[PDB]
Amino acid sequence: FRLPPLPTIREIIKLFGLRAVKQLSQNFLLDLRLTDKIVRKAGSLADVYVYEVGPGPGGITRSILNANVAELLVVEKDTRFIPGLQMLSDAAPGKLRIVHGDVLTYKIEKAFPGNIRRQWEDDPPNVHIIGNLPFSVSTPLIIKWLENISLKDGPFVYGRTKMTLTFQKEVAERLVATTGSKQHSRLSIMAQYLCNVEHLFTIPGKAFVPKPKVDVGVVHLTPLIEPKIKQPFKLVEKVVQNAFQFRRKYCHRGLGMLFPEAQRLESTGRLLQLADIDPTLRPTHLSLMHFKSLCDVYRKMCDEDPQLFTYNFREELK
Numbered sequence: 001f002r003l004p005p006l007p008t009i010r011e012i013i014k015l016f017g018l019r020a021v022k023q024l025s026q027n028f029l030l031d032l033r034l035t036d037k038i039v040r041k042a043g044s045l046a047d048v049y050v051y052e053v054g055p056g057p058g059g060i061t062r063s064i065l066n067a068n069v070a071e072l073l074v075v076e077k078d079t080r081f082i083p084g085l086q087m088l089s090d091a092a093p094g095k096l097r098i099v100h101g102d103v104l105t106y107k108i109e110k111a112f113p114g115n116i117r118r119q120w121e122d123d124p125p126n127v128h129i130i131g132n133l134p135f136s137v138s139t140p141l142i143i144k145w146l147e148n149i150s151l152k153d154g155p156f157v158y159g160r161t162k163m164t165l166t167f168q169k170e171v172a173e174r175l176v177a178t179t180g181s182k183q184h185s186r187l188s189i190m191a192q193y194l195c196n197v198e199h200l201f202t203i204p205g206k207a208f209v210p211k212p213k214v215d216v217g218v219v220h221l222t223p224l225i226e227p228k229i230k231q232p233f234k235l236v237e238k239v240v241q242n243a244f245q246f247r248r249k250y251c252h253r254g255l256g257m258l259f260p261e262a263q264r265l266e267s268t269g270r271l272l273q274l275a276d277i278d279p280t281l282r283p284t285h286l287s288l289m290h291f292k293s294l295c296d297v298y299r300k301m302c303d304e305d306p307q308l309f310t311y312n313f314r315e316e317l318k
């Protein structure tokens with residue numbers, strides 16, 4: 001019988017390679033004109049110490065290196081892109097530093113000279129964070145970094161360092177969404193109460209390899225001199241999370257989950273009364289100032305009742 005020919009090594013390597021690329025679910029930006037645009041929209045990187053997260057092939061890395069950068073540190077998790085990055089460092093004498101690490105855990109507190117550090121109320125320091133990461137990494141990273149801004153530590157020991165990151169279109173939308181909008185949610189409050197957030201532009205998915213199912217939003221973030229809420233991050237996070245869980249219901253329904261059932265009617269009413277908020281407002285209409293009132297009242301309630309802050313309504317429902 002006539003059987004199909006054997007696959008060559010080229011075909012075997014191709015079959016493994018193409019499937020290895022799809023395996024980590026990423027979107028490479030090979031358009032140097034686009035990576036130039038991201039860098040351009042981020043502002044002037046002249047004499048700025050730049051931290052790039054997940055450089056990969058090095059598209060943005062190249063665009064950063066061509067921008068009068070004082071120094072560029074990159075942290076790369078995949079060791080397969082490390083050789084090419086080293087090659088790129090060779091073309092730029094003393095401009096590139098490479099680390100094989102995880103951005104979710106790597107500390108940059110001392111990666112740059114302490115002299116470039118600035119006061120919080122000062123102008124933003126000569127540190128800038130830029131990166132195009134996979135969607136699974138970018139989302140928890142900003143949430144980690146928002147908490148760092150709250151604590152004024154981590155990347156923000158240098159001061160109010162800027163961020164220019166890519167997010168999936170919908171996430172980028174929520175980050176900048178104003179009150180009343182359908183995309184106004186947790187990320188909206190969590191980012192805006194700590195940062196000035198600007199949606200620079202949106203890159204269509206066609207420009208990425210391989211092609212993602214969605215478009216990619218480019219967002220610029222700058223920490224505020226005075227945060228809109230002055231409570232612990234985890235407290236703000238819990239109130240915001242509970243407020244937005246039932247989107248089609250009165251905010252009273254969601255905020256009520258902060259309190260044990262035996263006190264829920266009275267405490268939820270008291271919370272909204274003291275915070276001076278209409279109990280019938282849908283969560284989408286809750287502004288940063290509404291949450292400041294909710295958080296401040298909830299804080300006083302927690303200080304009065306130490307059982308309150310670690311209450312979880314799911315555990316009670318079981």
Ligand SMILES: C[S@@+](CC[C@H](N)C(=O)[O-])C[C@H]1O[C@@H](n2cnc3c(N)ncnc32)[C@H](O)[C@@H]1O
Pocket residue numbers: 026027028029030053054055056057058059060075076077078081101102103104131132133134137
């Ligand atoms: C979609 S590529 C982006 C690279 C570049 N922006 C581009 O498109 O040309 C994402 C890169 O980030 C790296 N990466 C993913 N998760 C990471 C993590 N947790 N820490 C550090 N790097 C990570 C991967 O190695 C991958 O090369």
